[PDB]
XYZ file of C-alpha atoms in Angstrom:
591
model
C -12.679 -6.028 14.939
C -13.282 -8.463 11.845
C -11.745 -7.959 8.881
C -14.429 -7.671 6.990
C -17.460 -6.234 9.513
C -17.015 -2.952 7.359
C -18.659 -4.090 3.863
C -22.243 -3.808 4.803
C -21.665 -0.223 5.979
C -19.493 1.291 2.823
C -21.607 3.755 0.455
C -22.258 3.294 -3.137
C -19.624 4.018 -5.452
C -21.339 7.788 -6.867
C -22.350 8.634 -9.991
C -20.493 12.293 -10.757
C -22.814 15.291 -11.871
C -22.710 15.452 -16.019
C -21.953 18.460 -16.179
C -18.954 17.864 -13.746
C -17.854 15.064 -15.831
C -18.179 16.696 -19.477
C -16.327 19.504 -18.569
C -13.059 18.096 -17.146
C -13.413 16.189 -20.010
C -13.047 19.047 -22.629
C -10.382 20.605 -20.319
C -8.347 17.528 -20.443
C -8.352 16.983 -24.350
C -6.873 20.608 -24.798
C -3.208 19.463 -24.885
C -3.651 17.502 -27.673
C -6.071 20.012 -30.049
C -6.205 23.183 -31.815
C -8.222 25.726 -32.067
C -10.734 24.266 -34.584
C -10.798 20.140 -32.896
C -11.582 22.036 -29.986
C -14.297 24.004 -31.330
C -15.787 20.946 -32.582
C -15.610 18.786 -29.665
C -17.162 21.138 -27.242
C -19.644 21.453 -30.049
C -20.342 17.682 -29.799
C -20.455 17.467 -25.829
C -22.641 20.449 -25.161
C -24.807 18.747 -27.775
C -24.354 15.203 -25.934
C -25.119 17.231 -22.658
C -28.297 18.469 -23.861
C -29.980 15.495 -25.729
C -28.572 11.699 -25.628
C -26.481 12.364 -22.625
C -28.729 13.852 -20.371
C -31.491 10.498 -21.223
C -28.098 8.191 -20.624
C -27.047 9.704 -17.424
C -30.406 9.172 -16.323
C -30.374 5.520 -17.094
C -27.471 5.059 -15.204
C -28.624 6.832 -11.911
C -31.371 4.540 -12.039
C -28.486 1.441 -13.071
C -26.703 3.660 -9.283
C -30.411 2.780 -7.605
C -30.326 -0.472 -7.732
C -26.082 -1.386 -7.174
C -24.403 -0.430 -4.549
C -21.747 -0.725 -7.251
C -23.024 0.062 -10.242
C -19.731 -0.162 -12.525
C -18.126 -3.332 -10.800
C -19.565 -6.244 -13.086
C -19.382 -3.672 -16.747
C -15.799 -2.978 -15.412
C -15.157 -6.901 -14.747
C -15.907 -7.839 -18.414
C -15.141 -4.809 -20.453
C -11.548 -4.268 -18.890
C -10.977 -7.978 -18.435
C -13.130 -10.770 -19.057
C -14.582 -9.795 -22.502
C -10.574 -9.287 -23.569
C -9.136 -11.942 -26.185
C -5.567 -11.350 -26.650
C -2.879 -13.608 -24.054
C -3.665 -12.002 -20.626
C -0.781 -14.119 -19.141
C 1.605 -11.209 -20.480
C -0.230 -8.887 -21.183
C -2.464 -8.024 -18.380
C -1.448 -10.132 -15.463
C 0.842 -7.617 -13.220
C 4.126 -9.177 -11.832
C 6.546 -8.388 -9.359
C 9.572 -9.764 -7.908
C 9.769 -10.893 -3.591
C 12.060 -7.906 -2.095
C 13.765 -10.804 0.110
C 16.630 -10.384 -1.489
C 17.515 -6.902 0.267
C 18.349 -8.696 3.300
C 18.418 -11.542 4.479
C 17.879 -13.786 1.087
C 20.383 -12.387 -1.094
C 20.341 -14.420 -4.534
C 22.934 -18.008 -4.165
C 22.272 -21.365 -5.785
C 21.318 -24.244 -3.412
C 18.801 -22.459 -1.642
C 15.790 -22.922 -3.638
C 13.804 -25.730 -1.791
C 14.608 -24.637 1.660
C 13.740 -20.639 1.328
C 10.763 -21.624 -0.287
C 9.607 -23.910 2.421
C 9.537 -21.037 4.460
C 7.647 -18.659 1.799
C 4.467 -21.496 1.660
C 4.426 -21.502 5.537
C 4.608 -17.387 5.928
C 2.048 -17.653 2.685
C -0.101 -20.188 4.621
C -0.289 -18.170 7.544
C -1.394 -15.100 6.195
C -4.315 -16.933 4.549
C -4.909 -18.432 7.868
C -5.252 -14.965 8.995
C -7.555 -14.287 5.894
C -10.022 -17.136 7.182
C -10.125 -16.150 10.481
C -10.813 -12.600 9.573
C -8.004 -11.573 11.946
C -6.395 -9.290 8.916
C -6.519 -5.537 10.027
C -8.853 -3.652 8.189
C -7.773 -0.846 6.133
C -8.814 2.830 7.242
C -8.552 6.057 5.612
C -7.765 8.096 9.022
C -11.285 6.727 11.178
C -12.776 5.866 7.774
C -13.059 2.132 6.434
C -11.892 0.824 2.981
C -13.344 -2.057 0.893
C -11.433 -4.807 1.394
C -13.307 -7.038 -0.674
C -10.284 -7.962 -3.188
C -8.647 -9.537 -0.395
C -11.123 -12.581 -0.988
C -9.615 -13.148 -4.850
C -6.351 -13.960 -3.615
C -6.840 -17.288 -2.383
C -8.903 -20.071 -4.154
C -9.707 -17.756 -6.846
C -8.727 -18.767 -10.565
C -9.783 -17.464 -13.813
C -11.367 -19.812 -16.592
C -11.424 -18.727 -20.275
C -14.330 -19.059 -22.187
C -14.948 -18.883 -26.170
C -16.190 -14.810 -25.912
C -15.846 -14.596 -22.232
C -13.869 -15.094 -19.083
C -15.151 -16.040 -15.572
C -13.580 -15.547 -12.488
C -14.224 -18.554 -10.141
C -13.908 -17.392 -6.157
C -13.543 -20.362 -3.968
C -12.473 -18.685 -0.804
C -14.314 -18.480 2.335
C -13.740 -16.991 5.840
C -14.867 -19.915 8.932
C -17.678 -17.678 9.499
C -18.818 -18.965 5.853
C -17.721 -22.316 5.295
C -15.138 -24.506 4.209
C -12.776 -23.005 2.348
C -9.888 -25.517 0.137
C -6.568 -26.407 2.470
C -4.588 -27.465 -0.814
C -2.041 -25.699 -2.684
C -1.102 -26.472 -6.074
C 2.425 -27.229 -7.546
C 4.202 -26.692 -10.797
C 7.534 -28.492 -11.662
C 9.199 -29.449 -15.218
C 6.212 -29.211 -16.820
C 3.983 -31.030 -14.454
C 1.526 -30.672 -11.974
C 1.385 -32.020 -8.261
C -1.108 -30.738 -5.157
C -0.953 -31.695 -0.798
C -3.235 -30.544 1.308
C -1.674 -27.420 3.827
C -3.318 -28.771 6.981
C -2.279 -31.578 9.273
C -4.373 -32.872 12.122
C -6.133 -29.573 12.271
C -2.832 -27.329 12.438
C -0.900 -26.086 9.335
C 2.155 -27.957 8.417
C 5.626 -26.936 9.154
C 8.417 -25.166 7.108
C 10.714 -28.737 7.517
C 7.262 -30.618 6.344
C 7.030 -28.340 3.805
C 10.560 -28.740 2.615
C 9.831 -32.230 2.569
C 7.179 -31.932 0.045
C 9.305 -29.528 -2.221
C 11.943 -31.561 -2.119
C 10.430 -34.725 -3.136
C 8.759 -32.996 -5.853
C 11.919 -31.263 -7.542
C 14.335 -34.666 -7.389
C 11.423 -36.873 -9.183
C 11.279 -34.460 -11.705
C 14.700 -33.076 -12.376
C 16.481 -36.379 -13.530
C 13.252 -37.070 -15.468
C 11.677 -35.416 -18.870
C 9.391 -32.374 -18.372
C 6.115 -33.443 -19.049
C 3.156 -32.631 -21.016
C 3.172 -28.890 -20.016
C -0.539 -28.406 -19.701
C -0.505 -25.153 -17.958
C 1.314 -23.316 -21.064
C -1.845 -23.517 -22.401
C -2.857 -20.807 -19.923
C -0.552 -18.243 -21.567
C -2.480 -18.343 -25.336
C -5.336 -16.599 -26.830
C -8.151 -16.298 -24.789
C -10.476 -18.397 -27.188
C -7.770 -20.715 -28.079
C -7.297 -21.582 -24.415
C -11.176 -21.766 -24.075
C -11.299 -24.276 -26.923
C -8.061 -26.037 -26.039
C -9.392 -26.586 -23.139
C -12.971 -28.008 -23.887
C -10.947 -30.499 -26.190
C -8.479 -31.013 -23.195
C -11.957 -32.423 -21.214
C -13.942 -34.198 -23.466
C -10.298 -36.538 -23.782
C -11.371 -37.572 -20.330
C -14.022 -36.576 -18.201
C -11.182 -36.390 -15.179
C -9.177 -34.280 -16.527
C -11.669 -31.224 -15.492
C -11.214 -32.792 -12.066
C -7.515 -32.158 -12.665
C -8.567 -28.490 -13.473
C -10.646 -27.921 -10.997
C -7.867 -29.144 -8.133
C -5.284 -26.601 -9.525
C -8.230 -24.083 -9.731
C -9.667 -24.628 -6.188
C -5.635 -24.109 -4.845
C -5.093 -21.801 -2.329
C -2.272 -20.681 -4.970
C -0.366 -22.286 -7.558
C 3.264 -22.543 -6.686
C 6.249 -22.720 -9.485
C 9.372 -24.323 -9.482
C 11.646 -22.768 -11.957
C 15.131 -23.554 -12.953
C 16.279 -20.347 -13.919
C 18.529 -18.092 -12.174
C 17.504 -14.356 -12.753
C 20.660 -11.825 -11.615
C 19.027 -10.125 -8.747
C 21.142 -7.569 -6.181
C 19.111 -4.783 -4.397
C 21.118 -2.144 -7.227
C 20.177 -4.561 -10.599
C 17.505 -6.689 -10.523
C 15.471 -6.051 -13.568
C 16.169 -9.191 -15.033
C 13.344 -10.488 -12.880
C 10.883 -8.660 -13.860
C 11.930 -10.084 -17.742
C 11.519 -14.137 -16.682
C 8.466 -13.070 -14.440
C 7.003 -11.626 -17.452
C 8.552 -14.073 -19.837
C 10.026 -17.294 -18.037
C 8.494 -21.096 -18.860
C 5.059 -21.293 -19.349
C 5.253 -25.168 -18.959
C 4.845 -24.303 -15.259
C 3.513 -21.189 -14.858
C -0.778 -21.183 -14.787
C -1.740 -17.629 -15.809
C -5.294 -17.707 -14.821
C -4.893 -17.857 -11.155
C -5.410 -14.952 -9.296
C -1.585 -15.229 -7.363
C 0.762 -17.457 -8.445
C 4.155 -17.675 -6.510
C 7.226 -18.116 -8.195
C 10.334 -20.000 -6.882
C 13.944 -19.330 -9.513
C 17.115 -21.663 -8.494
C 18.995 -18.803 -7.016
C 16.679 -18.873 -3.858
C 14.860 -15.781 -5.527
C 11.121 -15.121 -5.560
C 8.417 -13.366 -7.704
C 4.770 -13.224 -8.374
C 2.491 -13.530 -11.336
C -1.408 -12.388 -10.853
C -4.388 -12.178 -13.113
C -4.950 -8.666 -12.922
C -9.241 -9.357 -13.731
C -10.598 -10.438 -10.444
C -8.190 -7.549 -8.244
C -5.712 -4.982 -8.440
C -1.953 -5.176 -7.290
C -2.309 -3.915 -3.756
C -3.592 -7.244 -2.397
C -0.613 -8.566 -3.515
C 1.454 -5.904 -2.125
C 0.603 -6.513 1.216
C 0.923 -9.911 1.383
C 4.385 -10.007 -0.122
C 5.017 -7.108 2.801
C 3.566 -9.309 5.291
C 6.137 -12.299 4.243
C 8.935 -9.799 3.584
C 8.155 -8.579 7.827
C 8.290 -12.624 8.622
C 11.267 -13.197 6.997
C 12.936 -10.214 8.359
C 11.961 -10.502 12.005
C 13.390 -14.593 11.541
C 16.117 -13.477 9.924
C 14.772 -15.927 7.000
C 15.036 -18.814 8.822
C 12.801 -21.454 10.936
C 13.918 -21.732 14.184
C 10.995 -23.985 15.806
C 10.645 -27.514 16.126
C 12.869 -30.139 13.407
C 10.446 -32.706 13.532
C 8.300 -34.054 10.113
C 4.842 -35.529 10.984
C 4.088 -38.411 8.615
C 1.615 -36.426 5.821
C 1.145 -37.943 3.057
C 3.360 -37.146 -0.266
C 2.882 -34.369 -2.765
C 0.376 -36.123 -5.421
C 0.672 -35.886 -9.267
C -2.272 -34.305 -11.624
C -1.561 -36.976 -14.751
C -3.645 -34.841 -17.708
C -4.701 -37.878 -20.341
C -3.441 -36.148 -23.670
C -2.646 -36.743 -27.516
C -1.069 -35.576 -30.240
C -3.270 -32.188 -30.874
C -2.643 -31.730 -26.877
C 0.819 -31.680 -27.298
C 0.631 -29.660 -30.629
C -1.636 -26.658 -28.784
C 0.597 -26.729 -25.915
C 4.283 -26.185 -28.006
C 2.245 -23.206 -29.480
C 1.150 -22.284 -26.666
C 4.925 -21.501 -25.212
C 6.389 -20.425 -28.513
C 3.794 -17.770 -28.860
C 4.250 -16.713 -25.002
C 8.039 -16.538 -25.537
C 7.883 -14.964 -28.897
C 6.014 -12.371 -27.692
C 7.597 -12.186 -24.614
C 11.050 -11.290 -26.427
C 9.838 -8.401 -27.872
C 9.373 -6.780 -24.170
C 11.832 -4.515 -22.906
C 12.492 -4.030 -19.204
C 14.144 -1.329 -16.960
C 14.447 -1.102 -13.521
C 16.700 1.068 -11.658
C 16.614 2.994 -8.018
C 16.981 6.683 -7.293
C 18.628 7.425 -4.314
C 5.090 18.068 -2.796
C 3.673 14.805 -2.757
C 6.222 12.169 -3.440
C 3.188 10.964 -5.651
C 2.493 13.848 -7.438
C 6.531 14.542 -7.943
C 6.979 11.272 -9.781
C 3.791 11.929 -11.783
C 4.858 15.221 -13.131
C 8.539 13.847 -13.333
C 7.164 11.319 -15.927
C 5.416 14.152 -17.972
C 8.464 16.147 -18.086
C 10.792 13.327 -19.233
C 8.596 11.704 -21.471
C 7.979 15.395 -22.975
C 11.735 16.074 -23.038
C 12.397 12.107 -24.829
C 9.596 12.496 -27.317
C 9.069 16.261 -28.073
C 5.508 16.092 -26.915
C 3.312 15.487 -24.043
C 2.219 11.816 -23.482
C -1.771 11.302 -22.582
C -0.766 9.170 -19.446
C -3.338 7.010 -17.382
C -2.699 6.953 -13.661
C -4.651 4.680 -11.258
C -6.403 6.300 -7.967
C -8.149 3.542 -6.264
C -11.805 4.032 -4.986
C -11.874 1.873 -2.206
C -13.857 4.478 0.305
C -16.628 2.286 -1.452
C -18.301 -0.411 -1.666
C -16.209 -2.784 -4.007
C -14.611 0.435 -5.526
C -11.690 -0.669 -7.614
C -9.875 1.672 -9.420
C -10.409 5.316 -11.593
C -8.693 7.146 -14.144
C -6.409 9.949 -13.194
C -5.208 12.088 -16.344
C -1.860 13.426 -15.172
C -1.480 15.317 -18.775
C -3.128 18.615 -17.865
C -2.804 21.350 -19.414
C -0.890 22.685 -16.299
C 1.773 20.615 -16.684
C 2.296 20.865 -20.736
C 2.438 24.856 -19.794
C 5.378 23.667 -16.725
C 7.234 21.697 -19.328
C 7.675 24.326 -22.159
C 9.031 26.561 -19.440
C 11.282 24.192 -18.663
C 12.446 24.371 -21.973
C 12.216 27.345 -22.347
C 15.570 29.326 -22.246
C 14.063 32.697 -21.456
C 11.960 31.243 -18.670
C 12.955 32.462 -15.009
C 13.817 29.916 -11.535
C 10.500 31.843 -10.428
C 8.350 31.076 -13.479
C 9.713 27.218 -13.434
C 9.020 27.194 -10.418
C 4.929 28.534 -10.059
C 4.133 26.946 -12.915
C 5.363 23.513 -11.265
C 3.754 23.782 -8.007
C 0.263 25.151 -10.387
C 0.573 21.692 -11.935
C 1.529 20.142 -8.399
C -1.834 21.406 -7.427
C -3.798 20.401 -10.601
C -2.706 16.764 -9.829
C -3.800 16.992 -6.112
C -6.789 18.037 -6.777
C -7.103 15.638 -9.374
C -6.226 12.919 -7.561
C -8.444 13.653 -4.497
C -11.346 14.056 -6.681
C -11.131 10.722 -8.699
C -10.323 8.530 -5.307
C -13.359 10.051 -4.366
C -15.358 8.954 -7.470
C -15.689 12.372 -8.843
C -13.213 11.456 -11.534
C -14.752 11.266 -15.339
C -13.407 8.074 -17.390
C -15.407 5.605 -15.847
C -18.338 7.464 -15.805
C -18.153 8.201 -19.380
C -18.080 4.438 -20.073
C -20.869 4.043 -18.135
C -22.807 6.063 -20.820
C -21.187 4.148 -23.391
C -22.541 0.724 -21.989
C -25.523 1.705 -20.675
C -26.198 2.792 -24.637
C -24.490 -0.392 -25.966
C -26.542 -2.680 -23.372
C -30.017 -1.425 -24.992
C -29.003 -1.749 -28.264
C -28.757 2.235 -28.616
C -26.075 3.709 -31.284
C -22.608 4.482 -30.277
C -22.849 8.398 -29.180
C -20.467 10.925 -31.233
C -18.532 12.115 -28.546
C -17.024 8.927 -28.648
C -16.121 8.846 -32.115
C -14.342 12.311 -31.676
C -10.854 12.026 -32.476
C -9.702 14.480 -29.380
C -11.499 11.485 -26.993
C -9.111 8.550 -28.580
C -6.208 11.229 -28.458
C -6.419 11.918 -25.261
C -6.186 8.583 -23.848
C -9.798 7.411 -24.303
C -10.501 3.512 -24.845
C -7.182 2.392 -23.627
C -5.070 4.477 -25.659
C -2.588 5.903 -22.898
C 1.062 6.308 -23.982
C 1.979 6.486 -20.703
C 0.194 3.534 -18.068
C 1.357 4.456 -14.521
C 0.493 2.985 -10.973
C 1.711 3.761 -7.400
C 2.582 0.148 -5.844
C 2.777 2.429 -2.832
C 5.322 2.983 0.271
C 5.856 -1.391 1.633
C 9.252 -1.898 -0.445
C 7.196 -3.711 -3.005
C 7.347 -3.421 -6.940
C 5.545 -4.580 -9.742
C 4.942 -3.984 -13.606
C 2.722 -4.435 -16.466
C 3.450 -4.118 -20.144
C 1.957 -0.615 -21.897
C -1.274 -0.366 -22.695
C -0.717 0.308 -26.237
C 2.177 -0.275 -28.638
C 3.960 2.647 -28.856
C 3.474 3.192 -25.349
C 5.122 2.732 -22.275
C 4.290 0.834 -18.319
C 5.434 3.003 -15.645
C 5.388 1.573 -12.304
C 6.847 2.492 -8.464
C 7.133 2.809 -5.155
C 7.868 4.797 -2.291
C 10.625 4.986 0.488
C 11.582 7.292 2.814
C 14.994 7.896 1.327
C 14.314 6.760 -2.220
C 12.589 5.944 -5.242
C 12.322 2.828 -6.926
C 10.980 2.636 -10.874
C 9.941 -0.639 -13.416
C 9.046 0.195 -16.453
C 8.433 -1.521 -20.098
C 8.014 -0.819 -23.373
C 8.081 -2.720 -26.984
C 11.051 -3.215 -28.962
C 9.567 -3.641 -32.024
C 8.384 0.241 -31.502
C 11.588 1.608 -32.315
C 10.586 5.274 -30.829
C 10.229 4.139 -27.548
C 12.922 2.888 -24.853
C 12.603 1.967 -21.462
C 15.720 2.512 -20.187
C 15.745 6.076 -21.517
C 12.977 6.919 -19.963
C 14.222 5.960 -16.595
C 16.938 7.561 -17.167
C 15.411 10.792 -18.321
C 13.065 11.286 -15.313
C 15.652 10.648 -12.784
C 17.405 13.832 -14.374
C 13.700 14.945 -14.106
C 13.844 14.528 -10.283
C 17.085 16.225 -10.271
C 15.832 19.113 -12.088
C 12.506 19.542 -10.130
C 14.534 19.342 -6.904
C 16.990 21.997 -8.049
C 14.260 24.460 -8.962
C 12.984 24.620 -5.369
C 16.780 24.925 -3.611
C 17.793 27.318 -6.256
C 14.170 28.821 -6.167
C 14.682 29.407 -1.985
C 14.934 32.980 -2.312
């Protein structure tokens, strides 16, 4: 079995009935309207449903006849691409290496060495990428896409003045040749080696070799021009920075395209973030934050070595979503575990040749973009506040519910929240929109605020809402959810010059979360010891990422300072009361 033999035979990602669609979307704007807004918004969807609607939906079954994907490129550019503010911090997704739960523990010195071994366990897995030897994912007997497992080698972003492209260099043997070079970031410079060595990949004491050379040239020397903190800036600032970056010297895109073309860009940092299985959030802060000067925000997965032999990820969230990630930084975390984190094959360093340095040709207005470039990043960045903690009926469902009841409880009011539920039974499905605010659950939190309310009440109205959310969730993994179709009416409108339909305009559809205006922006990272974070999707909103173990629960989350109502560490702290609650009310509610 290949690990991509699959692709040719996954269906088209549906297009839901309109009907369907329209009406759990007026059942999902209730908890935010009265009476009359009601009134008037069913008013403008049964109108939508009979007229404009009905002649859009239309248009995009026959968009559905034609793409066995028919949202995948709109989502691409609309979501990502078309975007202008920094995606660096703001959209790339981040997540710290769990090594440090066993056999890695954080201690000074062991920077170089650990991370020989993370390139080689890195290496491999993309050998196992190539050779299409990765397992492919199955829902019970059922194959997933796995077609975001090609954007995490090779693959870079590159800005452009009104929009982004995604370049995807990798290729399986069965395709081609496919770049052996990885890219490296130290002191504000840029050096690249090729991965492969008479035919075989190089070792974890050749790799040290390599690291090591790099990081003493640079350490006693000044950091240089810091080209990649352009990467962190405005979308058309970078675009134009970057033209003017080329046109300096024709090589210099030569430069670009080597760090591009990288396997993955590696970073050497010199920070030392306080991580301990119990505390570790500070992590997630210099992931996030951190030195631009050698950090390149357009690439798809870019590893990140600290001093105190810890380890993180940045990734452009645009070409994939987090799971990719996920398993590969489970497939390392396996390695390092069954080695005990260490290399215990041959000592011996082949003569390859040395690590060589990308020399950018710059001037003054270079060097003027580029210390904007990181004071903007790290202004902005200082404004983010991150908490990250570990608490020790779907698990998935309980957490999702959980986060409705605290934020409810925190902020006197339910909180539209976004939840992802991936699509992947098809062809190139990405992701869906999974409204965890129902009106179930509002009607479960009053009652548990609610002083007259019984155990039993508490307790059926929780498990109505459990079901809501099951359903829910089922339903939208299986592309009957409603947000993306609902864009799809939008663009297909938009793309032939047709007005802007009402429904849009509504108040109740911005209220309820529509156009990216979730409070509350929540993702599984699922049940491989992995976590990650974004920051929230709107300003006074919050990011509300975990993942799943056996015996625990583990919970990032971020919000903005400069929002004064909001506070991640309540938060966290109010929903694992939440849990405690919920749990109570079935023992108490045995009976």
């Amino acid at each position: 079995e290949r690990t991509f033999q699959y692709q040719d035979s996954l269906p088209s990602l549906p297009v839901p009935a309109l009907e369907e669609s329209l009406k759990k979307y007026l059942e999902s704007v209730k908890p935010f309207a009265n009476e009359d807004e009601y009134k008037k918004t069913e008013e403008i969807v049964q109108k939508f449903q009979e007229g404009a609607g009905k002649r859009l939906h239309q248009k995009l079954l026959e968009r559905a006849r034609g793409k066995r994907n028919w949202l995948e490129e709109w989502w691409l550019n609309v979501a990502y691409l078309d975007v202008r503010i920094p995606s660096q911090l703001n959209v790339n997704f981040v997540g710290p290496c769990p090594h440090f739960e066993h056999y890695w523990p954080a201690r000074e010195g062991t920077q170089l060495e650990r991370g020989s071994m993370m390139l080689w366990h890195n290496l491999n897995y993309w050998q196992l990428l190539r050779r299409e030897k990765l397992p492919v994912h199955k829902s019970g007997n059922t194959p997933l896409d796995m077609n975001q497992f090609r954007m995490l080698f090779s693959t870079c972003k590159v800005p452009g003045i009104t929009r982004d492209s995604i370049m995807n260099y990798f290729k399986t043997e069965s395709e081609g040749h496919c770049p052996t070079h990885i890219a490296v970031l130290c002191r504000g410079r840029a050096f690249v080696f090729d991965v492969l060595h008479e035919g075989c990949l190089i070792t974890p004491p050749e790799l040290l070799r390599q690291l090591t050379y790099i990081h003493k040239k640079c350490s006693n020397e000044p950091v240089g021009p810091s080209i990649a903190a352009l990467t962190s800036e405005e979308r058309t600032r970078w675009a134009k920075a970057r033209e003017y970056l080329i046109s300096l010297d024709p090589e210099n895109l030569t430069l670009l395209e080597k760090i591009q073309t990288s396997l993955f860009v590696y970073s050497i940092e010199d920070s030392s973030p306080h991580a301990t299985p119990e505390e570790y959030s500070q992590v997630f802060e210099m992931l996030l934050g951190g030195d631009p000067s050698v950090r390149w925000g357009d690439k798809s997965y870019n590893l990140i070595s600290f001093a105190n032999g810890i380890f993180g990820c940045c990734c452009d969230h645009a070409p994939y979503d987090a799971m990719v990630v996920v398993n590969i930084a489970h497939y390392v975390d396996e390695r390092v575990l069954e080695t005990e984190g260490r290399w215990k094959g041959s000592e011996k360093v082949r003569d390859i040749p040395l690590p060589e340095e990308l020399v950018f040709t710059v001037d003054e207005k270079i060097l003027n973009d580029v210390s904007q470039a990181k004071a903007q990043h790290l202004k902005a960045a200082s404004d983010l506040q991150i908490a990250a903690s570990t608490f020790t009926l779907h698990p998935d469902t309980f957490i999702q519910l959980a986060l409705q009841l605290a934020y409810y409880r925190l902020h006197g009011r339910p909180g539209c929240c976004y939840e992802t539920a991936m699509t992947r039974y098809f062809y190139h499905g990405r992701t869906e929109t999974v409204r965890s605010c129902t009106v179930e659950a509002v009607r479960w939190c009053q009652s548990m605020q609610d002083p007259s309310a019984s155990l039993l009440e508490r307790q059926q109205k929780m498990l109505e809402a459990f079901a809501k959310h099951n359903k829910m969730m089922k339903d939208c993994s299986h592309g009957k959810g409603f947000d993306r179709h609902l864009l799809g009416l939008l663009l297909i409108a938009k793309e032939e010059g047709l007005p802007v339909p009402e429904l849009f305009e509504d108040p109740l559809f911005s209220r309820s979360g529509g156009g990216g205006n979730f409070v509350l922006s929540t993702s599984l990272v699922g049940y491989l010891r992995v976590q990650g974070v974004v920051v929230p999707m709107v300003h006074n909103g919050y990011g509300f990422f975990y993942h799943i173990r056996d015996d625990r629960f583990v919970v990032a989350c971020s919000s903005w300072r400069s929002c004064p109502e909001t506070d991640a560490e309540k938060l966290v702290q109010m929903i694992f009361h939440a849990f405690h609650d919920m749990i109570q009310l079935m023992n108490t509610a045995h009976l």
